[PDB]
């Protein structure tokens, strides 16, 4: 009974919050990424990196606070507290955006710690590890968006900043610069997310409305017992209902529940692949054949051509303030505008 | 055409800053999350009825009376993943939650669009943060407004004759 | 020479056919615009 | 429209190659005992 086995005994004790070996990684990294986010959004400015106020201390609200990305001049510097940029000065580290990399890096290692927790608990209780496998999708999204996307770009500055409206800026940046709505990988993502919410809604509603009467109450939640062997709802009735309403229906409960794993997980993976492309500006920006035609035929107009003009407006009107390292001076006469507005 | 509708809508109504849209997002991200979670937990707790050389889906027979997964095992996993009282042990409660979460969230999304139909817009924090002199200190909402302006000045570029876009 | 005992029959049921074809045709319909460009 | 000259063959094979793969596996499943 060595010291490893006694430490393993303690880490795997049945307690209120299970720890585990993964908890050594997970619990400090998650706490710091969470705590770094609250600290930065409560007290930390973005004045020197972005020229923005981003904290409750400066007057922002929950929608507008953020821990913003470091300055573009930092490149992809790890921005360690002891690194050559902050030189151990905590105050300067906060001013240079070191909390962004702190949250991103500890968030990354925490997410690893969380998937390791999923494996560890599934192995201890004796279930298959599909929940960890399904968690690969949010990890793939986090890694592609928060790490691979800025690594492909000029600096961490162009990553998403950890804030509500800051994320909204990230969304509108991707429309205006990348035409990301046109990207078939994003479209697959949308289908997986919306298809996932549909399956969530329809499966929940189908189970609740094909329940067997297992008790006398009109509120039907009491009629379930977790030790029952019997199905609590009628798969046969559900199948007949959906086959007659929609044409097709599930008839295998295992395939149904796998498909529910598969749909949102595949969608998020597809979107991650699209974002990796956008790291290198490999956009699905334009359809070459329409651009050739629109250039030569000034009467050819489509919803795609209209969207490109919207995108040109986004870039011109947002770039001077969104990218203050560039020192864009766009005089009023160069800004694209339609008539009147 | 859908994307054009979305971009112009954001330009004119700041839909991203409207809490009903935000509840819509929580409805759909949560719905996809819960779809993944429920799918994964049920699949993880499937009871062995098949060998390695065949799909585990043949372990279920259509209209069989027995449960095909061990909900006590799944609760025992997920209540150790988070904590015990965070996890459903009642399948009826669990499935109601899977119904109610994306449905209530999408209802808020629909009401968002339908109330921006009457031009009650998302939150406007443009120039909310002012220094001691009175200088505007930009926030992320101010950066959103620049993007919004770019769509607004460019959309329907020949249709407007007067300074305000009123409907 | 004795036959190989690791050989296994392969199956694809009809619903799997319909699902796969749905998948392939929808990916085709989705990506076709990008392939023509 | 001036489209990619390989878009038709790329689309036709992207359809036909995995579709025939699935058809092959379906048909030989049905013929099993």
């Amino acid at each position: 009974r060595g010291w490893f086995d006694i430490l393993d005994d303690w880490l795997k004790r049945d307690r209120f919050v299970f720890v585990g070996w993964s908890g050594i990684l997970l619990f400090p990294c998650a706490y710091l990424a969470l705590g770094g986010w609250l600290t930065g959004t409560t007290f930390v400015t973005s004045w020197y990196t972005h020229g923005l106020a981003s904290s409750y201390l400066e007057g922002c609200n929950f929608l507008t606070v953020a821990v913003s990305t470091p300055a573009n001049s930092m490149g992809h510097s790890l921005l360690l507290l002891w690194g050559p940029e902050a030189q151990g000065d905590f105050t300067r580290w906060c001013q240079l955006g070191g909390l962004w990399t702190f949250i991103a890096l500890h968030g990354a290692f925490g997410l690893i710690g969380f998937m390791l927790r999923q494996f560890e608990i599934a192995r201890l209780v004796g279930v298959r590890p599909y929940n960890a496998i399904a968690f690969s999708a949010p990890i793939a999204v986090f890694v592609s968006v928060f790490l691979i996307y800025p690594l492909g770009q000029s600096s961490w500055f162009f990553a998403p900043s950890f804030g509500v409206a800051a994320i909204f800026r990230f969304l509108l940046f991707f429309q205006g610069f990348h035409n990301w709505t046109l990207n078939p990988f994003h479209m697959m993502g949308v289908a997986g997310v919306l298809g996932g919410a549909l399956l969530c809604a329809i499966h929940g509603a189908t189970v609740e409305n094909t329940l067997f009467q297992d008790g006398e109450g009109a509120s039907t939640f009491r009629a379930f017992n977790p030790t029952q062997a019997e199905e609590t709802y009628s798969m046969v009735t559900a199948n007949r209902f959906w086959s007659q309403i929609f044409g097709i229906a599930f008839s295998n409960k295992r395939w149904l529940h796998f498909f529910m794993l598969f749909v949102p997980v595949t969608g998020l993976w597809m979107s991650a692949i699209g974002v990796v492309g956008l790291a290198l500006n490999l956009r699905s920006y334009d359809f070459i054949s329409q651009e050739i035609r629109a250039a030569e035929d000034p009467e050819f107009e489509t919803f795609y051509t209209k969207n490109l003009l919207l995108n040109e407006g986004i870039r011109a009107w947002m770039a001077p303030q969104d990218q203050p390292h560039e020192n864009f001076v766009f005089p009023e006469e160069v800004l694209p505008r339609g008539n009147a507005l | 055409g859908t994307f054009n509708f979305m971009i112009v809508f954001q330009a004119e109504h700041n839909i991203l800053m409207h809490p009903f849209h935000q509840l819509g997002v929580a409805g759909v991200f949560g719905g996809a999350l819960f779809c993944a979670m429920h799918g994964s937990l049920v699949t993880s707790s499937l009871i062995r009825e098949t060998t390695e050389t065949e799909s585990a889906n043949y372990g279920y027979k259509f209209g069989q009376e027995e449960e095909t997964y061990n909900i006590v095992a799944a609760h025992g996993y997920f209540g150790r993943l988070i904590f015990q009282y965070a996890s459903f042990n009642n399948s009826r409660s669990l499935h109601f939650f899977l119904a109610a979460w994306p449905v209530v969230g999408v209802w808020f999304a629909a009401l968002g669009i339908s109330t921006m139909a009457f031009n009650l817009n998302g939150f406007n924090f443009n120039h909310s943060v002012i220094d001691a002199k009175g200088n505007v200190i930009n926030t992320w909402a101010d950066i959103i407004n620049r993007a919004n302006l770019g769509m607004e000045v460019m959309h329907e570029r020949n249709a407007h004759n007067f300074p305000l876009d009123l409907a | 020479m004795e036959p190989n005992p690791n050989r296994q029959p392969v199956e694809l049921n009809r619903t799997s056919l319909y699902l796969g074809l749905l998948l392939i045709l929808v990916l085709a319909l989705l990506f076709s615009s990008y392939f023509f460009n | 429209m001036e489209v990619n000259q390989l878009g038709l063959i790329a689309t036709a094979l992207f359809v036909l190659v995995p579709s025939v793969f699935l058809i092959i596996l379906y048909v030989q499943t049905e013929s099993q005992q």
């Binding site: 097709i248 008839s251 | - | 049921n13 | -």
Partner: peptide
């Protein structure tokens, strides 16, 4: 060619709907 290609793929999908509905493997209670 483009228009024909898109309509062709679409028409195959509609046909697949027809077979998936009217020529499914029948759910059998066992």
């Amino acid at each position: 060619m483009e228009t024909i290609t898109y309509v062709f793929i679409f028409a195959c999908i509609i046909a697949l709907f027809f077979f998936a509905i009217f020529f499914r493997e029948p759910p059998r209670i066992t």
